[PDB]
Design a protein around this nucleic acid. Sequence first.
DNA 1: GACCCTCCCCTAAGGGGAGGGTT
DNA 2: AACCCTCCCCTTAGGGGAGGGTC
Lengths: 268, 268
Amino acid sequence: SQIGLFSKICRVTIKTLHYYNKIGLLVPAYINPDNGYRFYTSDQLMKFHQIASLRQLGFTITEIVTLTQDENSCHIIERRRLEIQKQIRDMADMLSRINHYLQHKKKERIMLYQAALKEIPECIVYSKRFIVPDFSSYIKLIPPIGQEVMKANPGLTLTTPAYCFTLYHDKEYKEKNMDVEFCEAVNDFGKNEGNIIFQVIPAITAVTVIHKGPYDSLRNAYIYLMQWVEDNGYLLTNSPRESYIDGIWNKQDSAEWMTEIQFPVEKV
Amino acid sequence: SQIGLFSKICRVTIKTLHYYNKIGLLVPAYINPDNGYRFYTSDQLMKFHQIASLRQLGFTITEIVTLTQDENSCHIIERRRLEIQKQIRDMADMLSRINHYLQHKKKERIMLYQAALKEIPECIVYSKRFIVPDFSSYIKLIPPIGQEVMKANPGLTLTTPAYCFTLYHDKEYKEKNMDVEFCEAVNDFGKNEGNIIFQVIPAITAVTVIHKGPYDSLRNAYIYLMQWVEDNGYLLTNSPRESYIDGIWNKQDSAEWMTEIQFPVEKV
DNA sequence: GACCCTCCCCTAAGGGGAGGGTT
DNA sequence: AACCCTCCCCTTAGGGGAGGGTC
Ligand code: 118
Ligand code: 118
């Protein structure tokens, strides 16, 4: 049978048959010497049925080749059964997250915060832990904490880029007192003194948002992420971080400052 | 800041930023015309965060370009929400079919029958329906049906390719006293004569298996598919068909005959 | 040493078209 | 008018490298 009739027996295109001949998957029975026409037989249909049966399960062309021509090779099959099992979960994750998105967007018709999952490697910081009655006092007391360590240490060179942040060790926030820690990232180790010390901070996988404006609205960010971990089936595994990007040290207008809120989470 | 530092702030590659600047997404702040360098500001971070957040939900590049500037248009979100569910339903079916494949090949070292789904369009047929005591009497009594209609209907042309099959209208699989109909597909209508009738068979979606060899073991095929429909959560909708591809009219070696069993099914 | 630019070819499974040949 | 063949570029979201200029 010619290529045009065999293409209607199998309900497949002609370019597909040309491609399969080029790859080496389905070779015709007889090829005309001067014209170059292709003629097919019934066993070609017997093989095309097997090809389509394998292709309907998601295998790629190379695995289909290795499955038809070679020995049974069961180890290829189970490797696909994992690749599906993982993939479903990913889809089942995204269908959740988009359902959050609409559920907020159609509520307000404007989006102030957008969350994103990312990875933060491990670092080496100098740090100071203490209790604070009011956040403004914490802002006021940190620059001398920087001055002491920068003067009293040889070769204290910051990182590129700059990573400076605050750790909240409290379980449920309250404005009265706050067990806080100040951390700034450096390159090497050294000598310790006073109430400030060097320590390593391990890597995390965190959901982050970015807040723009003054600090007096920062709580509005947290209420968002406390929702995002509750809807999409995640679990808060560690202390949050508050990293500082743009402030009084680079700018003059407080309505153009910029900070970042980070929640380390796991999938539960 | 130069591009090599900004790529460290964003935790992406440089080729990504080049590609984005080319396609018109996140164009840099200030390009110097003498050397051609790209300088980024802290204003670009709050847009890259949004790009990555939209990208983590599965959207494509053109969708992200259309979203960040036409923000009133929100039906793309539903357009993606439906496709997510469709993909989930497809993967959950591929998983069960892979499981059936491994379960079948587990105990039996090799497998003969490989099922595959396909579409069959509507057709015009001439047919004749009756009761037979056995299958052999059926095979012997067929050819008069083919001779008579050609005698009484001059100029009646078959289709290309040929489609010649039989329908088993009985509810339970049997071996004797079978209620069977014989159908052959033609191009144009005609007139009825006796029990021979003309009708139209509708279009179906079916799972198919190809049997090769003598007729007597064909029952095995009817077993295998009957397992499949039960194993993978399908429902049989209509009578099975038996379609003839290679037989005694083309060959003498009965070990080269080819036939196809087709079960019309539905995902229930 | 360390950084940066433009330009060309590559990915999987075919799709679409231009141009030439025979009955 | 109908079939058939071969050659060339096209699709995603960026990767890899060569050659050459700039801090
Ligand atoms: C030690 C302690 C605080 C600061 Sb900074 C800062 C530095 C680099 C990158 C981001 C922030 C600061 C303040 C005034 C003038 C110059 C630098 C700082 C201040 C308040 C809150 C968080 C950080 C610096 C060293
Ligand atoms: C009407 C009735 C039977 C056949 Sb055939 C057949 C021929 C070509 C392609 C497919 C089928 C037949 C057999 C012997 C001699 C002449 C014609 C046929 C017979 C029994 C079972 C299945 C098909 C054709 C028309």
